[PDB]
Amino acid sequence: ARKLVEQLKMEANIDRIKVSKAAADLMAYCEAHAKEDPLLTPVPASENPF
Amino acid sequence: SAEDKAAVERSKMIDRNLREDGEKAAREVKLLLLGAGESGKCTIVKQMTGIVETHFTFKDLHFKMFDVTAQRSERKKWIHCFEGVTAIIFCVALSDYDLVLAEDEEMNRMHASMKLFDSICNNKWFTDTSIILFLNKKDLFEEKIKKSPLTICYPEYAGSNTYEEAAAYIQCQFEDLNKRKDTKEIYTHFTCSTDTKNVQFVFDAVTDVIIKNNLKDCGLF
Amino acid sequence: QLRQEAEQLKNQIRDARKACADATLSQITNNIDPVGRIQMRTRRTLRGHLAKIYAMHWGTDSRLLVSASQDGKLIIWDSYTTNKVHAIPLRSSWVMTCAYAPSGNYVACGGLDNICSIYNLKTREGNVRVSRELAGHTGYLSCCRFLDDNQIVTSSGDTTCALWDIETGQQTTTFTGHTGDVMSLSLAPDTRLFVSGACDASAKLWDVREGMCRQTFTGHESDINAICFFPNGNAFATGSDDATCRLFDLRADQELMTYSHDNIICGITSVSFSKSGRLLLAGYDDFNCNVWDALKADRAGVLAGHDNRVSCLGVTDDGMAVATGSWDSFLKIWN
Amino acid sequence: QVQLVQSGAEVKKPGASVKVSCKASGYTFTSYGISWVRQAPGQGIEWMGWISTYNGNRNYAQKVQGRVTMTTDRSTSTAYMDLRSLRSDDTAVYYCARHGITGARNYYYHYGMDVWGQGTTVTVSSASTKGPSVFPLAPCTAALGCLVKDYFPEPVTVSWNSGALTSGVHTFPAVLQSSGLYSLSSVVTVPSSSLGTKTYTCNVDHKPSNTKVDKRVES
Amino acid sequence: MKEPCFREENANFNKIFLPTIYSIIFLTGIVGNGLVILVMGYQKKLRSMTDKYRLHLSVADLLFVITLPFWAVDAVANWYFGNFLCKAVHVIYTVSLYSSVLILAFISLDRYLAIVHATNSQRPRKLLAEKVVYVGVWIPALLLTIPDFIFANVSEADDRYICDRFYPNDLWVVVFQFQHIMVGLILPGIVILSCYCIIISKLSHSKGHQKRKALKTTVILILAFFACWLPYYIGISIDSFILLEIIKQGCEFENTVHKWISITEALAFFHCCLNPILYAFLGAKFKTSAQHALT
Amino acid sequence: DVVMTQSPLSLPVTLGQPASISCRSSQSLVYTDGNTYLNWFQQRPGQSPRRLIYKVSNRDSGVPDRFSGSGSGTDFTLKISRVEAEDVGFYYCMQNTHWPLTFGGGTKVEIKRTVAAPSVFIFPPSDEQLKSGTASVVCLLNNFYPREAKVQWKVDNALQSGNSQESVTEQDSKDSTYSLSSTLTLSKADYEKHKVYACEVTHQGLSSPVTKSFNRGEC
Ligand SMILES: CC(C)CCC[C@@H](C)[C@H]1CC[C@H]2[C@@H]3CC=C4C[C@@H](O)CC[C@]4(C)[C@H]3CC[C@]12C
């Protein structure tokens, strides 16, 4: 029980951010690298290894 | 393109090796050992890290036995690896009715054995895997019944304090705890101190299992 | 005394998480246009296994992959030409995991024997030989990934995860805190943190050097079977046995979006992402593989080629291909 | 080609026996059968048998039953027909024609008589070879001729001036006498404008005896 | 010598009934064999020891079935296909007929090995089904079609062509009929009746459900084979006997026995339809494989 | 068996006009499988019968389209559309459905011509036959039409019958006419006892019965 109390203390004294900020960051990352993603946009058979 | 043809030849060679290895593996017999009370690993090992594999050959047939009593983790997370074994060998101590579990006195130990047998026999993976039942410690049980009547374990038991009748009753109860009567069979044997006879029954049971599997495969039913 | 304080500490954490819940991900990702219905067809079909397949891994060159099966074989394939480059026979045939080192020199294996084996591929004579055997765990090994050419991290069923050292062969650090068996593990892209989901329906973020658990995420109903990081390393997605998938964020420190459907009643065995983080792939018990959408939670494709349960799945580093292996003893490559 | 060739003409005595052959060619012999048909002079055609040329299953006419036997020779591809106990009524012309179809499983007789070999003439009489006697015809436009009586056997070809005249010539078919030998006549007509200056002669040819008789005819 | 017996045929019995039976058999057999071949070829798991025998038998049955429309057309009006097909049809018919009966004997041997000697007989079955099938099924079948090449050719009469094996004298017919019966009934019959009987002698006294289920299927197989192939060979035998003159009962007897042979050969043609039902669609494993191959 | 009769026994033809030969059977010529196996033959003199049409209607290859057949049941016939000089000879119809096969009576297809008077000649016997011991005289009839000719011998105005032979020549290729011969053969005793000899000729084209006579010594 002593370890659980000590463990909880460390995990509670950290800084949080709003959900909207993380969601916007994920959306920005998805948009930025969407140009080079063979699965989203199929590559023409000229450069397709398979 | 010498490298391409060399690679194709190497692929063909190590592909031909796999077929031979697979044939040799499919020619063998694999058994799984289980036990509830005393870990069920005492008699079988001597008569002949986590999982212990034992090999022996009897009458031009290669047997293996996997002992999973050292895997004290959650059983539903790794029991699906053993689907497809030829048979399951189960150990029950007959001289366990009058005793109680070490952790608590509320539960009789042989009721725990019945519970484990119910869990194993009616599991969803083992619908066609036949079960070989060994009832161990027949001498101690025969000595024990006379001093202590068999009524502490079965309140519904009504009969003489005789070894043969009590043994038949216990065997009937364990065999009646089965549900899939049309897809698997349960073989019962009372372990004997002559190991040759004890290892002849396993051979006969596995031969019967093999014959039924061949019937299913060959299309006769 | 300690029990009462622990409940109070957890209450403040829950209150803090609720305050940060400004707007859910779907509301602000409503504007983006949905991706077209993804339809991938099998390119190759690798065969030669004679039993179930329980794991696989992709090389860092996007060409060579290693697969572990119950027949007692560990095969390195070549995805381009289907040729087998190696076939390493295991000492124990109950294997549940494999890994293929970033350098390409080594592989790994594990299973019910509680022992991790590191094999050396590029030997002097050209023959694959065991380079080390790692023992010390008290439960079945479930996953193992290479940090680098000399260090490897493993997670077992004894509710522990540990960091090893191949040359000296002893446990260097041990991460404890879980309640049930640890079933999966995933390394960060920067290889400084990793997370593992356990059987207690919870996931934790560890530190390879500090050795202390930093964060804990809850919300699942049953066993967690798979896990993986989002490509930029700020998020990870978990799939559990109760027929659901969930996405967490480390900075926001709570759940964002749940991918579920009413028709799905079977659990998930493996998940993986795409190169840009737009296609959360998942493997399902009902012989199917579903392609999700990390931002809109709308199914965009189905991969139905296997006659038995799908148990492993992975995506190449360049994003060119995705390979699935199932209990029918066949591997397939989609593109 | 698909054709059938038979024997030659022959003269016999009453009570004797005859055999004629029908050599076939140009077709698979062992897939059909051979039927033997006769035709009496001045009387309708009639049938007297069948044979198989394959497992030899012969059948015979009711009237000629017991007096005729048929055999075939598969090696030389020919069929025979043996007849015995000949009367004077047997004078006819015997023909040979393919008839019926055979085989392992198909075996019929409703397939028509197509090839129809040329056929041989058969005669029966109680006599031997005699020489013909030729006499000129003395008349009183005028005609002239030669008379042949009491000769045997058929035929005899009469030529006028050894074939020097082929205008207004008539040859009369021979007729059987009651005695048992043939007799015929041939008459040619030439206008009597110059009857006395011209002369006419006959050159008869009795092939079985090599007899040639020359007669000059005057009134 | 003796009189001549000429065949006589009924217009209806040869014109309306035989074509319908031939068409029904053609359709049913082609559907069944097509389904079996597609299921066997489209499965991806492996080729079990008995999955390599169903394919031989399906191929032989398909070759037999393809022959039927030509016989139906011949029975309706006449032969229009020339002289080359009058040989090709006979060759195909003979090959398929002999192979489709030798494969049954090999399947019976396979099953007897797989049940009676269960523990140790894993090698001989593979050797049989991978090497000896070609030596013992297809080679003799091919070598027994020399008479079809030689003695079969169409012949012309009036305006009707007949396609039949034309033999020089009666003896060839008898020799080839005795060879036909000896190779088509006696050789596989004893093997089937000697293996399945000693299988059901061992699957009888057991009280299990699966053994009791397999006993009925084996008995069904034994009865089906003989009840399908026996009357035709009885007719062939009593025809060969009268061709030797050892039976003399007039000509109406010969016409009657020929009618019996003609009516029972069509019944014997149902083997190409009863084989897929008995050997493929009565098995649980094959049913599961077919359900998998449906998707 | 099955008896077949065909009519007319004779049938004269003019060129370009149809001719019809009809034969009807005793029973119904239908087999169990149907069809009707009756076929027609033509036998040009000095040859063998040649198939013309089979199965009542089909015509075998190589036969001129002029010949045609029709009918069914137990009454049917053969008809020629256009007749030329190469349609002269006997015709027969044969059935092959029952066992055995049978042939028709036969119809001679003569060629018709305008009626012409006959030229009558008399050739008295010569001396060589008389010294031999046989006397024979002939009453020549030449280049006439049709076959109808009643010729009887008149000796001493008495009718003699039973001792005369007749011969008739076939159609003339150039004119289609006939030629009959009547021979009166008598012994020396009968010949000397009688003085006057003549033949009475009656012809359809003849207006009055012509009689040519002679006496011994004059000729
Ligand atoms: C004209 C005659 C010889 C028929 C020719 C076709 C025969 C020879 C061919 C047709 C299809 C072929 C089969 C096709 C596929 C297989 C599967 C393989 O694992 C074993 C051989 C086997 C079973 C083949 C044997 C030969 C076979 C049966």
Side-chain angles (χ1 to χ4, degrees), chain E residues 47 51-53 55-56 59 63 95 129-130 133-134 138 142:
Chain E
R47 295 271 190 63
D51 291 331
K52 290 184 207 158
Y53 281 117
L55 183 62
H56 288 294
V59 167
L63 271 69
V95 159
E130 301 295 70
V133 288
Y134 314 110
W138 295 111
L142 286 182

Side-chain angles (χ1 to χ4, degrees), chain D:
Chain D
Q1 207 57 42
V2 291
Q3 299 165 239
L4 270 65
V5 181
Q6 299 185 30
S7 300
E10 71 156 50
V11 296
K12 301 295 292 184
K13 300 292 217 328
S17 179
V18 300
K19 269 185 61 91
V20 295
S21 66
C22 186
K23 297 131 60 193
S25 77
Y27 67 110
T28 186
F29 193 52
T30 53
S31 179
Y32 299 83
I34 296 170
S35 177
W36 279 86
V37 189
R38 90 163 164 195
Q39 165 179 0
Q43 191 268 120
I45 294 181
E46 51 196 357
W47 172 82
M48 64 183 73
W50 187 72
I51 198 156
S52 180
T53 67
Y54 164 87
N55 78 15
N57 279 29
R58 43 71 170 171
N59 190 342
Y60 290 100
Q62 183 48 290
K63 44 177 281 168
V64 72
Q65 191 93 249
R67 294 182 66 250
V68 70
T69 60
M70 317 205 178
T71 61
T72 73
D73 190 359
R74 185 178 65 248
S75 296
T76 56
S77 281
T78 177
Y80 294 60
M81 201 274 267
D82 194 2
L83 183 47
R84 40 214 171 80
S85 171
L86 288 189
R87 298 185 278 282
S88 276
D89 191 3
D90 272 297
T91 305
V93 179
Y94 295 81
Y95 291 82
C96 165
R98 181 179 73 186
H99 187 246
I101 201 163
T102 49
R105 151 192 310 271
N106 284 300
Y107 192 77
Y108 318 99
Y109 68 106
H110 61 84
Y111 289 129
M113 312 185 48
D114 202 337
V115 290
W116 262 106
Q118 52 198 60
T120 62
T121 184
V122 171
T123 182
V124 177
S125 77
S126 69
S128 161
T129 305
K130 330 316 172 192
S133 72
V134 179
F135 319 114
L137 276 298
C140 303
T141 65
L144 216 51
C146 284
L147 161 72
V148 177
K149 176 185 174 129
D150 205 5
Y151 82 98
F152 188 96
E154 207 170 2
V156 159
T157 58
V158 183
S159 180
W160 271 111
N161 291 117
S162 166
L165 194 139
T166 60
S167 68
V169 290
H170 286 290
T171 304
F172 287 0
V175 66
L176 183 84
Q177 294 182 176
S178 200
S179 178
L181 281 74
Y182 315 143
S183 64
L184 67 83
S185 295
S186 296
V187 181
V188 61
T189 300
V190 164
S192 79
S193 65
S194 178
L195 75 164
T197 74
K198 311 297 296 304
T199 183
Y200 318 95
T201 55
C202 293
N203 270 38
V204 304
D205 292 325
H206 197 37
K207 265 171 143 41
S209 287
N210 297 50
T211 303
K212 168 179 80 61
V213 168
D214 294 4
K215 291 290 184 181
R216 184 176 291 175
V217 192
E218 268 90 4
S219 163

Side-chain angles (χ1 to χ4, degrees), chain C residues 2 5-6 8-13 16-17 19-21 23-40 42-122 126 128-209 211-335:
Chain C
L2 298 182
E5 186 181 8
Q8 284 171 263
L9 280 161
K10 287 179 69 66
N11 265 9
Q12 174 195 339
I13 287 170
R17 275 161 200 228
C20 290
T24 67
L25 164 72
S26 183
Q27 322 177 239
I28 73 167
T29 53
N30 197 3
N31 307 353
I32 59 172
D33 286 344
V35 298
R37 285 251 161 191
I38 309 293
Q39 183 154 295
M40 326 184 272
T42 186
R43 294 324 181 175
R44 277 90 167 91
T45 198
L46 317 172
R47 70 187 64 199
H49 277 300
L50 303 148
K52 306 188 190 150
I53 297 187
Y54 275 105
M56 74 169 260
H57 204 87
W58 273 103
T60 71
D61 57 11
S62 315
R63 253 177 55 73
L64 296 191
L65 61 91
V66 64
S67 86
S69 66
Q70 303 279 120
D71 54 1
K73 283 330 199 302
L74 195 75
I75 291 177
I76 296 89
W77 307 80
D78 196 335
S79 287
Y80 285 174
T81 61
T82 313
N83 313 128
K84 306 174 181 61
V85 181
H86 287 85
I88 314 162
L90 271 298
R91 312 212 159 170
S92 176
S93 73
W94 317 110
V95 298
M96 293 180 183
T97 182
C98 73
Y100 186 11
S103 299
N105 296 309
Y106 293 99
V107 297
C109 193
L112 281 179
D113 63 358
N114 296 323
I115 290 191
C116 189
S117 300
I118 296 89
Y119 293 79
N120 188 354
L121 275 154
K122 295 278 176 323
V128 182
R129 63 211 190 66
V130 160
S131 175
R132 199 68 66 166
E133 268 165 329
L134 271 53
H137 271 294
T138 64
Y140 64 99
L141 196 66
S142 43
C143 196
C144 62
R145 303 301 163 195
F146 270 92
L147 263 183
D148 66 78
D149 218 323
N150 195 54
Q151 283 176 348
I152 176 169
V153 56
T154 61
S155 66
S156 296
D158 67 312
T159 78
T160 65
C161 310
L163 170 80
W164 296 83
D165 189 0
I166 297 169
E167 277 189 353
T168 316
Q170 64 284 10
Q171 292 184 90
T172 300
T173 316
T174 292
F175 313 107
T176 78
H178 270 301
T179 295
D181 312 340
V182 189
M183 298 270 278
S184 66
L185 184 142
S186 184
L187 268 296
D190 51 68
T191 64
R192 306 194 60 92
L193 303 170
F194 75 101
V195 296
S196 58
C199 294
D200 59 359
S202 71
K204 294 189 185 297
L205 196 167
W206 309 94
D207 198 334
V208 294
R209 302 143 164 273
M212 190 149 165
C213 171
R214 294 252 284 186
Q215 285 159 239
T216 302
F217 310 88
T218 61
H220 267 287
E221 182 205 0
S222 295
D223 296 290
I224 293 192
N225 289 344
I227 187 176
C228 185
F229 279 52
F230 200 76
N232 68 76
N234 275 316
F236 71 91
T238 45
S240 66
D241 193 76
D242 69 279
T244 194
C245 290
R246 298 176 186 274
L247 186 64
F248 301 86
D249 184 285
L250 307 182
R251 267 186 314 183
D253 204 277
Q254 65 182 250
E255 168 161 81
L256 281 72
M257 185 179 288
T258 304
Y259 316 95
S260 63
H261 197 258
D262 285 301
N263 195 2
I264 291 169
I265 62 170
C266 55
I268 297 89
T269 49
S270 66
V271 307
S272 176
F273 271 98
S274 178
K275 194 163 162 324
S276 45
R278 191 54 190 267
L279 286 189
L280 169 47
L281 274 285
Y284 276 104
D285 291 331
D286 59 357
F287 308 168
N288 279 320
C289 165
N290 277 10
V291 183
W292 291 96
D293 197 343
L295 311 166
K296 291 192 114 201
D298 280 341
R299 195 182 332 152
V302 159
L303 283 71
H306 292 281
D307 313 298
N308 213 340
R309 182 188 292 198
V310 166
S311 56
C312 65
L313 188 140
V315 166
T316 49
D317 291 331
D318 46 335
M320 220 55 78
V322 60
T324 74
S326 62
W327 291 13
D328 58 354
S329 73
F330 294 129
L331 277 168
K332 282 180 188 188
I333 304 196
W334 318 80
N335 192 359

